[PDB]
């Protein structure tokens, strides 16, 4: 036979030039300030996988099925994508925008640490943001609900000083 | 014609035999299993080949087109057979000299054969004396050894 | 093995009852021939190094063993390839600790702490029984060891019985028969590590192995092979079990 | 030399192409044709696993047993007949099942001289 070969984690469109899909994806890319299409596609694949797990477990029965069902629900609401009282059916109503709201770049922007999405990306990449006492430099990292409030400037960063000229401009917004 | 047969629960052998029997009428299956292409391929299953130029020729386009397409005769190093290769580009024939060595590959027509208005030509020139022909046509590079 | 015996063992092909990381390195210790078989034993080096953690590298593990710091069934073992198996007793007298080797609920070997007094006895399952020259009876136990008894007591011992042996003197002190109502502990199969009491025994023609039915504490009945049932007491266990 | 591995013919009659060389553990040895002679002659063969066989090539005495369980050591005169091969009796070849004549009567050989190194026979009434 053949040994294992590592495979891509995302899927490409079936047809590269469809006008409606191009327009929709362009709107998303502009709004969330992503670097290239593949990054976007990555998140899409994640969404699809969740749905494909929900569809398979609805039509199943037995002992392992219940365990996997509760594990899926717990994982989904640990990420902050579902409320605490959601049921399995609610999985089938998630959208691509729901996942994009959990990116570290977006959350840094929404919390008011930056004036713009691009500034948030630069702040993350250069190492000015700490999450739960740890510095992370990946703008696409998905933030868990339990750690969302412990996101601040790094304690060694120049921005961790309210008199810094650039921070005062950020606070002005 | 009645119902498709056999449908019986214990008629597996006959059904398998029938399917195997009529699969030989599929031309794609027959050529793969009997390996008919490998038996007549001058390139011997390779994607590219290297050869030596013997002479320059020109081929007329088919009706209702008009024009002359510049090609060369190439003798293959690996087995000594002689084939015809098209030279793509505007004025590309001026960079070819007799006794040069070239790299050729498929021209890319339907069913791995010829394309366009020049049937009978199955290959095209890619390199001349280890230099890309496309560059030479565009410039950006000079043909070595004059 | 084109021309002779194998001397090596890859990590990926190691026995499935060990606690070992199969991708950290290339090679594993090939165990020496000894008391138990491959499926129910582990080399002593892994006990010294990986289980208890008294050593970090193999080189300093061998230095500990050569000083005679480890006792297996009351005897000093220096070979780092020595196999240690089911129902054995591992004693460290310098630290004063004792363990018994037992299968897990999923079939892996673990060390179960025991008291010092219990460390002097070992249960042995009578695996076979034969006549030997001079008209004596030889008993062959499940771990490969042997014992001799006179012709007078030939009716006090049969296969599948359990003998409680005092180690390292190897002196018999108790015989536990195999019958209805005996307390058993399962060593292999799907029902490994479950324990209970014997209810029924069944037999089959033409050499197929025989099956026993066991009732546990909660009152459930389950079947297993007779040779996988290890007698440990009359109506209560005589040794500590997890 | 003498190879005892497998047949080169399938039971249906088709031929078999050999797929490997001959292994050392599959070889035989020359048969020992135990003759009747004035003096006994034997050798020792080193065999697989470092074991030994005692091979008898010339025989002069025999052990003859009666239905009562007693045995006597007597010498061999000749071989009357041998069902194993059609011309063994003429050449005085002793194998298991041969009929020999001794100084106390006819006897039938019960041992394998090529494997044991001794000749044992039962007395015929």
């Amino acid at each position: 036979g053949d040994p294992k070969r590592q495979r891509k984690k995302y899927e490409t469109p079936p047809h590269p030039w469809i006008k409606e899909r191009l327009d929709r994806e362009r709107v998303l890319m502009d709004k969330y300030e992503l670097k290239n299409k593949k990054e976007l596609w990555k998140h899409e694949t994640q969404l699809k996988n969740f749905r494909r797990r929900a569809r398979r477990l609805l039509a199943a029965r037995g002992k392992q099925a219940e365990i996997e069902r509760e594990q899926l629900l717990a994982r989904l609401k640990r990420l902050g994508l579902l409320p605490e009282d959601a049921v399995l059916d609610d999985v089938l109503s998630l959208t691509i925008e729901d996942i994009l709201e959990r990116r570290l770049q977006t959350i840094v922007y929404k919390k008011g640490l930056a004036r713009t999405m691009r500034q948030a990306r630069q702040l993350i990449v250069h190492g000015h943001i700490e999450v739960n006492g740890q510095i992370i430099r990946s703008p696409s990292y998905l933030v868990l609900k339990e750690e969302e409030d412990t996101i601040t400037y790094a304690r060694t960063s120049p921005f961790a000083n309210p008199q810094h000229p650039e921070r005062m401009m950020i606070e002005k917004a | 014609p009645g119902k498709k047969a056999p449908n019986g629960e214990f008629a597996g052998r006959k059904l398998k035999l029938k399917r195997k029997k009529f699969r030989w009428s599929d031309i794609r299956y027959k050529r793969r299993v009997l390996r008919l292409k490998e038996k007549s391929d001058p390139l011997e299953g390779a994607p590219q080949a290297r050869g030596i130029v013997l002479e320059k020729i020109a081929v007329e386009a088919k009706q209702p087109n008009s024009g002359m397409r510049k090609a060369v005769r190439v003798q293959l190093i690996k087995n000594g057979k002689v084939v015809t290769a098209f030279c793509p580009g505007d004025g590309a024939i001026k960079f070819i000299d007799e006794h040069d060595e070239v790299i050729i590959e498929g021209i890319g027509g339907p069913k791995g054969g010829s394309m366009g208005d020049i049937p009978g030509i199955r290959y095209k020139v890619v390199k001349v004396n280890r230099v890309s022909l496309k560059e030479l046509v565009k410039g950006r590079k000079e043909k070595p050894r004059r | 093995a084109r021309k002779g015996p194998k001397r090596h063992l890859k990590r990926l092909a190691a026995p499935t009852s060990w606690y070992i990381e199969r991708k950290a390195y290339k090679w594993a210790v090939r165990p020496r021939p000894g008391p138990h078989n491959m499926r129910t034993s582990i080399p002593l080096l892994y006990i010294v190094r990986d289980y208890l953690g008294y050593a970090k590298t193999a080189r300093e593990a061998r230095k500990i063993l050569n000083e005679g710091k480890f006792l297996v069934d009351g005897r000093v073992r220096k070979d780092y390839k020595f196999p240690v198996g089911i129902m054995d007793v591992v004693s460290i007298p310098e630290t004063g600790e004792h363990y018994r080797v037992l299968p897990n609920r999923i079939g892996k070997l673990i060390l179960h702490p025991i008291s010092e007094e219990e460390a002097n006895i070992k249960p042995l399952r009578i695996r076979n029984k034969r006549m030997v020259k001079g008209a004596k009876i030889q008993l062959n136990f499940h771990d490969g060891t042997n014992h001799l008894i006179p012709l007078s007591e030939k009716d006090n011992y049969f296969t599948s019985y359990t003998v409680l042996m005092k180690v390292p003197e190897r002196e018999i002190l108790e015989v536990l028969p195999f019958e209805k109502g005996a307390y058993v502990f399962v060593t292999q199969g799907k029902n490994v590590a479950r324990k209970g009491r014997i209810v029924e025994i069944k037999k089959f023609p033409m050499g197929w192995p025989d099956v026993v039915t066991i009732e546990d504490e909660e009152g459930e009945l389950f079947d297993t092979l007779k040779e996988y049932a290890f007698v440990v007491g009359r109506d209560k266990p005589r040794i500590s079990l997890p | 030399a003498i190879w005892q591995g497998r047949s080169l013919r399938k039971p249906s009659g088709g031929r078999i192409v050999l797929a490997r060389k001959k292994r050392k553990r599959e070889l035989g040895r020359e048969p020992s044709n135990t003759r009747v002679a004035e003096q006994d002659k034997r050798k020792i063969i080193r065999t697989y696993g470092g074991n030994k066989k005692v091979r008898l090539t010339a025989a002069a005495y025999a052990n003859v047993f009666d239905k009562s369980g007693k045995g006597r050591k007597v010498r061999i005169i000749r071989v009357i007949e041998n069902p194993a091969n059609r011309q063994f009796a003429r050449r005085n070849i002793i194998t298991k099942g041969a009929i020999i004549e001794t100084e106390i009567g006819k006897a039938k050989v019960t041992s394998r001289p090529g494997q044991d190194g001794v000749v044992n026979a039962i007395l015929l009434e």
Binding site: A59 | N7, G8, E9 | - | -
Partner: protein, 129 residues
């Protein structure tokens, strides 16, 4: 020649229901056809039916109510295990609980819903929806 009395009955029923017949006669009767008719009546697909005795194998008289979309026999009679009913449902039925499959088990003839409740398999013989 005649090979399958059960298939003829179901094809006759589905042919008759498409032209608004109110009753039909099944000419060769048998115990299996009676069991299938009983199961069909339990779910409300047909009305009352009765057995008429000639000197031959007997006849069945069946009342139709116009509540059948399609009815057919399954050949060959595939064996099915107690947890494999979904793919056959997708093969023969239009929705996830639309209609019934009729199964012969060692406890009698029944719909596949009852068989799945009891946790047993059997042989598929017909579908109705």
């Amino acid at each position: 020649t005649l090979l399958d009395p059960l298939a003829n009955a179901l094809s006759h029923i589905t042919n008759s229901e498409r032209v608004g017949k109110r009753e039909v006669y099944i000419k060769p009767a048998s115990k299996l056809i009676g069991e299938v008719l009983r199961v069909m009546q339990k779910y409300g697909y047909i009305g009352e039916f009765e057995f008429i005795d000639d000197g031959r194998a007997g006849v069945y008289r069946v009342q139709l109510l116009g509540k059948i979309n399609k009815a057919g026999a399954i050949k060959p009679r595939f064996p099915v295990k107690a947890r494999d009913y979904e793919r056959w449902e997708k093969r023969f039925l239009p929705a996830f609980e639309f209609g019934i499959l009729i199964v012969s088990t060692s406890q009698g003839v029944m719909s596949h819903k009852e068989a799945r409740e009891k946790g047993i398999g059997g042989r598929l013989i017909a579908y109705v929806y």
